[PDB]
Amino acid sequence: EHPSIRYVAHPLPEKINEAKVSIKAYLTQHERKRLRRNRRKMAREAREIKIK
RNA sequence: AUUUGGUCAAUUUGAAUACAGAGAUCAGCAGUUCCCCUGCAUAAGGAUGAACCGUU
Please spell the DSSP secondary structure of A4-51, one letter per residue.
Answer: -SS----------------------HHHHHHHHHHHHHHHHHHHHHTT
Phi and psi, residue A47, nearest 5°: -60, -45
What's the Å distance between residue A13 CA and nucleotide B7 C1'?
105
SS3 A5: coil
| A1, A19, A21, A27, A29 from A24: Cα distances, Å | 57, 15, 9, 10, 15
A38 CA: nearest nucleotide by C1': B32
Phi and psi, residue A20, nearest 5°: -70, 90
Which residues of the protein have their beta carbon within 7 Å of strand B? A 33, 36-37, 40-41, 44
Whole-angstrom distance, CA of residue A29 vs CA of residue A41:
18
Torsion, CA A25, CA A29, CA A31, CA A35, rounded to 10:
100
What's the Å distance between residue A6 CA and nucleotide B44 C1'?
58
A29 with A37: CB under 8 angstroms? no
SS3 A42: helix
